[PDB]
Amino acid sequence: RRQPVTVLLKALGWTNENIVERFGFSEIMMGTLEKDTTSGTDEALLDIYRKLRPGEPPTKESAQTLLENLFFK
């Protein structure tokens, strides 16, 4: 529970300018992207990767490909 909307793009590595193009129309997510904990692309990884599993402190490399393992795989 308790998940933001815009953390996923930074989690996937999406560049910030791409969000404005797609989400710029009809506001919405742009306002959701305006309010966020952190804007760091790699920082969003460490924020979301720990939220789900928070046990056994997360590794840097293990958290990057974990989402590809959890979904893309």
Partner 1 sequence: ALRQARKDAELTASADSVRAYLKQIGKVALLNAEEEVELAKRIEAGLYATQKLAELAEKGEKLPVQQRRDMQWICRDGDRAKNHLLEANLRLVVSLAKRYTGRGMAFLDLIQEGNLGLIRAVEKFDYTKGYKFSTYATWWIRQAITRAMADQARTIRIPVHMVEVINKLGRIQRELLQDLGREPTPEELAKEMDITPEKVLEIQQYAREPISLDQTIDSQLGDFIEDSEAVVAVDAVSFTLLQDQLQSVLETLSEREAGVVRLRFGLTDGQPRTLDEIGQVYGVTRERIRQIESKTMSKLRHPSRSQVLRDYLD
Footprint of partner 1 on this chain (CB under 8 A)? Answer: 43, 46, 50, 54-58, 60
Task: State in angstroms the smallest separation of the CB of 46 from partner 1.
Answer: 6
Task: State in angstroms the smallest separation of the CB of 29 from partner 1.
Answer: 25
Nearest residue (CB) to partner 1, 29 versus 67: 67
Gyration radius (Cα) of the chain, Å: 13
Task: State in angstroms the smallest separation of the CB of 4 from partner 1.
Answer: 16
Quick one: DSSP state of residue 13?
A: T
| Residue reference for tokens 């959701």 | 32
Residue 25: CA count within 13 A, CB half-sphere: 2
